[PDB]
Amino acid sequence: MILSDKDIIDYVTSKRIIIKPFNKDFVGPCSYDVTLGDEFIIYDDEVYDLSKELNYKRIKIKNSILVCPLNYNLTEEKINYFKEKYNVDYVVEGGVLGTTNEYIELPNDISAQYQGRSSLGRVFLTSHQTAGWIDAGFKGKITLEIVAFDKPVILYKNQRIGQLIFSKLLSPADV
Amino acid sequence: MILSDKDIIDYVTSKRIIIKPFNKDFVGPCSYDVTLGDEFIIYDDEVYDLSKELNYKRIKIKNSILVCPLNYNLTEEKINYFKEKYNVDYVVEGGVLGTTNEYIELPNDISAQYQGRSSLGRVFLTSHQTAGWIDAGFKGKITLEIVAFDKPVILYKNQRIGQLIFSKLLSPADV
Amino acid sequence: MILSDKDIIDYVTSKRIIIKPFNKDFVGPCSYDVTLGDEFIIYDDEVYDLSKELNYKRIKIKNSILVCPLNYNLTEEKINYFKEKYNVDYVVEGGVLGTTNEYIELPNDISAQYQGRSSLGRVFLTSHQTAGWIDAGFKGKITLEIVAFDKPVILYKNQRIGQLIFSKLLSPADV
Amino acid sequence: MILSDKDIIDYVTSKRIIIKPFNKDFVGPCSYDVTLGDEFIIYDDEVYDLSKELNYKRIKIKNSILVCPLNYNLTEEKINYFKEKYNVDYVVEGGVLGTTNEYIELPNDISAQYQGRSSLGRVFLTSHQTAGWIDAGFKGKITLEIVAFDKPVILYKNQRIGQLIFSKLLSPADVGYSER
Amino acid sequence: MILSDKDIIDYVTSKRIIIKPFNKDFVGPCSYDVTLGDEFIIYDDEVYDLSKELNYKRIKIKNSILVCPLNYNLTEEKINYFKEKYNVDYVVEGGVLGTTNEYIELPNDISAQYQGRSSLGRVFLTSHQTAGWIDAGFKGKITLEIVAFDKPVILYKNQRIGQLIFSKLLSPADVGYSER
Amino acid sequence: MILSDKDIIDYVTSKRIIIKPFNKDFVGPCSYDVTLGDEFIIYDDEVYDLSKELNYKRIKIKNSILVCPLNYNLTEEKINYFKEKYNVDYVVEGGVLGTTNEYIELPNDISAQYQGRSSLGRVFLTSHQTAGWIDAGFKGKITLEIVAFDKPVILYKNQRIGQLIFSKLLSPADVGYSER
Ligand SMILES: O=c1ccn([C@H]2C[C@H](O)[C@@H](COP(=O)(O)OP(=O)(O)OP(=O)(O)O)O2)c(=O)[nH]1
Ligand SMILES: O=c1ccn([C@H]2C[C@H](O)[C@@H](COP(=O)(O)OP(=O)(O)OP(=O)(O)O)O2)c(=O)[nH]1
Numbered sequence A, B, C: 001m002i003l004s005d006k007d008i009i010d011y012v013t014s015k016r017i018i019i020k021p022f023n024k025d026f027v028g029p030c031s032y033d034v035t036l037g038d039e040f041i042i043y044d045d046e047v048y049d050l051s052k053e054l055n056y057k058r059i060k061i062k063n064s065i066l067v068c069p070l071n072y073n074l075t076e077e078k079i080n081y082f083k084e085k086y087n088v089d090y091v092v093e094g095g096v097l098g099t100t101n102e103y104i105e106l107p108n109d110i111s112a113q114y115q116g117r118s119s120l121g122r123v124f125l126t127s128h129q130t131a132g133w134i135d136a137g138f139k140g141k142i143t144l145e146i147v148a149f150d151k152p153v154i155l156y157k158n159q160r161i162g163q164l165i166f167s168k169l170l171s172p173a174d175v
Numbered sequence D, E, F: 001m002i003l004s005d006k007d008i009i010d011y012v013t014s015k016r017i018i019i020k021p022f023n024k025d026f027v028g029p030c031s032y033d034v035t036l037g038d039e040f041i042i043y044d045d046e047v048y049d050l051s052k053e054l055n056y057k058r059i060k061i062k063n064s065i066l067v068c069p070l071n072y073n074l075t076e077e078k079i080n081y082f083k084e085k086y087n088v089d090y091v092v093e094g095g096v097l098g099t100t101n102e103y104i105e106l107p108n109d110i111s112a113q114y115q116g117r118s119s120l121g122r123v124f125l126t127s128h129q130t131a132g133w134i135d136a137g138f139k140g141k142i143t144l145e146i147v148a149f150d151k152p153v154i155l156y157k158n159q160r161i162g163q164l165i166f167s168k169l170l171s172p173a174d175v176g177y178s179e180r
């Protein structure tokens, strides 16, 4: 059972579902729009070995970022070209980790799924690689996996980036 | 609660869920198979800036299309080579927008999720970049985001391309 | 209605949902962790034409495999370099098919969705290209579509690779 | 969850739930109205011992019946009085068995509950004395147990007597047997 | 599915379900307690014929009432005896209509069921003789049908008389009409 | 949604729902049958005032009991007649309290409803006069309120007396308290 706008509003009001910050204007028919944070993470190791601690660089943008498909072959000149042409603060190619501004807390009877925005999906920009289901009892902001699959895409700080679809559990969970 | 074949058939019959055109043979255990339209859209701008109107080219194929992974480096010769070898009408690399033939209308108590076909997923061809959830109250055809991630894939006009999974909402939505 | 840990445990116990092999420690708040098999499949044809029988190579690893993004341009030297540096048994670029060790059987009142692990999604490694919904009545192991979208990723035999989210159907299905 | 009018219509249309005869105008917001049959049964035993087949009489009214509360003491004189004053075909006191005209069939994923109508409950007339839940897989008409608890009540043949509330089961049920 | 205390609170808060007056402490694990109004109705007819508007009397108690089982035979002598011995404002026998103080409004996706409280059922006192399901979209107070089946029972004004069990509908229901 | 036989079995197996003693063959399509205990309670007061602890008598039958409708007027002569003619250990009239042999425990996500069995409702014998919904979190046996509305009915010790219908709650309920 997917929660409708009426249920989302009720759950947030009674604090069954925490969403900080919260804007009722982001409540859709059966989902809640979340926004893009200004902080990103770029890994700087040769390969991903989950058995080891990953090295990364923390990037914070002022207004926007240009996300290019992997192997876009970004040179010094190309980057400067893009910055001056599209007024982007940072230009990256390949994968980049972002985060929603919204911090959430889910009760033991609710599971949530994050999905990237439809308007961005139509331009081949995804903010999540997996289905996006989040365990009941979860607490924290939503980590985003941003990848462009066709051409560079401009993303803006605080812009709606996706939505959270809330689903009822058949029974309460033990976590 | 995901609708089973029995529920899909009931909802279509009473017009709670609209699906045009409709073929009962496309009704699966708990989903409905949709088909690929012959019309596609290819963007022709340098970058995607959602703050601006996007420029694109409308392509219509007769029978099939060959979708190549991005940066496949398609030259004049390669294209002609593929057309003559696989009898495809059009050859594209990177992202391409398509559409289901089926036009749908969802009631205020039903949310639907589109997912690309399993047989195509096994050959690394996706027709959707996001989770695919569609708001209750939605009306229209389903836009497809087609991308090949391993090797070129042939797609045929009117072939089953994915499925719609229908879910009940906990309460009716206000849209 | 998504099944919680309590429901998963009940359904497995009464054999409504089959999972072989089964480890109660893999039961999460509202999902079940599955593991990666040691057998993989690599297609060796020029293009994917679903109207024809696909040619492939069956690969079996001893401990681990390095999955590189497509067009990573793997040469003899690079491969040997990666094997000696990361102790991987096999190095592949682009798409590779894998499988969960777990064999499942779903009843007529349950639909399941497979999603790749969150820790792997954070390093841009996906084990499924589609939403991952599986029909009620389904029997068999879960086929995995593995693709790396940022940098090479090491995968280990028998490691948790994703999770199965179980959902109740509104009515029993006819298959 | 309880089936709304839209769900009842769908289930009848696809024959998931059988209702014979079916009247689309009997479908309410979240129930289906059923009507009173013209055949009633009156037991004829000193005490009721379920180990035995109870003795009874089968009567069939032409149009109406007057149900009096237990111990109303209906003498031939009183009976003729009521029949003439209210034009009722039959006069009874105490418990009387009736039936719905409607024959139903429930699937393995639906359970139904019968409830006597509120308008009759308002005059202390009941057509059931238990919750009235019906097992999924049930096939048949609904047996009614009619009792008046205050004053005699007039009931008419084919009148709406109660409603069926349909609820979904959490999972398909084993109806007790299977055929192949 | 039945709404738990958390669901009842949410629905009242957003006014999806109206309850007036509302007492947060009347919310139980999976129901809402309702209370007995001070106005009762007693019918005054030989028999009940629904084709007519039944004659009745409207009484209003100051604090309490003694409900005696039907055929208790209440003579002026007995009535004064009870009123003096138990200090009840009114003494009645048989069926009597009452009402809840609470006024409710149900949305198109909720159906409610009224049930008399267990503590009173334990002394064979009932405030309803049918299942008591209420249609989604209903607006109004709850009519009560009070009957004692063993010995006279004392009821007090404003006491908790029963509970409302709220259940979700499978789909939104057509409440019977619409306004634009 | 109502739990089907498969759900009842799962919940008992994992102890989410406690039922003692448990008989797997008492699991029906969408309910669980419960049985009649051998201990009954009969009140002994002129009127019932809930502000007080009512006086009662505790009887224990060896095998069976005859429940007669209220005002049946059971004299020593009549009582010995029934006991000898039907071999019943006890003869009572009016309301009598009984209990199920079964002890149950409900979790915070389940609500159960008790209903007297249809076969007994068919002879106008009821073991409950209210809807019978039980709060999630409830722990204990089921109290029964037995009343015959037509003729005396014979009940036997340990016989199936009714059923429990289990329904899922929309959300987990606060059972009223917590312990740490
Ligand atoms: O490939 C697609 C993309 C979108 N849609 C549908 C589903 C969704 O409900 C709607 C989204 O339309 P739009 O991009 O105008 O809205 P939005 O991105 O949800 O706006 P916002 O994030 O401000 O709520 O169109 C599809 O069916 N297929
Ligand atoms: O990675 C995968 C792909 C498929 N499946 C399962 C789920 C699905 O229910 C079934 C699909 O099998 P197949 O490709 O033969 O069917 P189809 O694409 O649904 O045929 P159609 O579109 O004509 O209905 O196999 C998995 O578990 N994992």
Ligand SMILES: O=c1ccn([C@H]2C[C@H](O)[C@@H](COP(=O)(O)OP(=O)(O)OP(=O)(O)O)O2)c(=O)[nH]1
Residues within 6 Å of the ligand: A133, A134, A135, A138, A141, A142, A143, A144, A145, C028, C033, C117, C118, C119, C120, C121, C122, C160, C162
């Ligand atoms: O992009 C992401 C990734 C994860 N999560 C949340 C959802 C999920 O429930 C949790 C997963 O955290 P972690 O990677 O530590 O756990 P795991 O991969 O589920 O461990 P395991 O597979 O051993 O159960 O964090 C998000 O919200 N967004």
